[PDB]
């Protein structure tokens, strides 16, 4: 595989590899096995995973940091929509929401520094 035809596009390659270091259980690293959950598509309206993130990125689908951030939030939320309030998988999605929530902040500022516009709040 190959990609990164613009300096903004290169940020997303290295950032996706930093979100992959926030899943130490490999729960989101791969797609949910339908062979043990055949009803997943009847309960989840927009299913996603880290392989689909990578494939979309290698297919030039992400031209703004907002969509790359929002599809990570979608992957977190799709766990929380199909689990019980006491499982490993539930708390693994809470772990991504916190730890990789920082990864999207530290990496957005590499685009904002060259996108220009206003500052502070």
């Amino acid at each position: 595989g190959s990609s990164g035809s613009s300096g903004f596009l290169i940020l997303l390659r290295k950032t996706l590899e930093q979100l992959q270091e926030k899943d130490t259980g490999n729960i989101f690293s791969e797609p949910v096995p339908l062979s043990e959950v055949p009803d997943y598509l009847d309960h989840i309206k927009k299913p996603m995973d880290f392989f689909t993130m990578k494939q979309n990125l290698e297919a030039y689908r992400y031209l703004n940091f907002d969509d790359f951030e929002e599809d990570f939030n979608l992957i977190v939320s799709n766990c929380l929509k199909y689990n019980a309030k006491d499982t490993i998988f539930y708390r693994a999605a809470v772990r991504l929401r916190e730890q990789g929530g920082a990864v999207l902040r530290q990496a957005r500022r590499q685009a904002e520094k060259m996108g220009s516009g206003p500052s502070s709040g």
């Binding site: 043990e36 959950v37 689990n83 019980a84 499982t87």
Partner: peptide, 10 residues
């Protein structure tokens, strides 16, 4: 019985 990953509660 059941603890996530099968669409069942109550």
């Amino acid at each position: 019985s059941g603890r996530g990953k099968g669409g069942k509660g109550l």
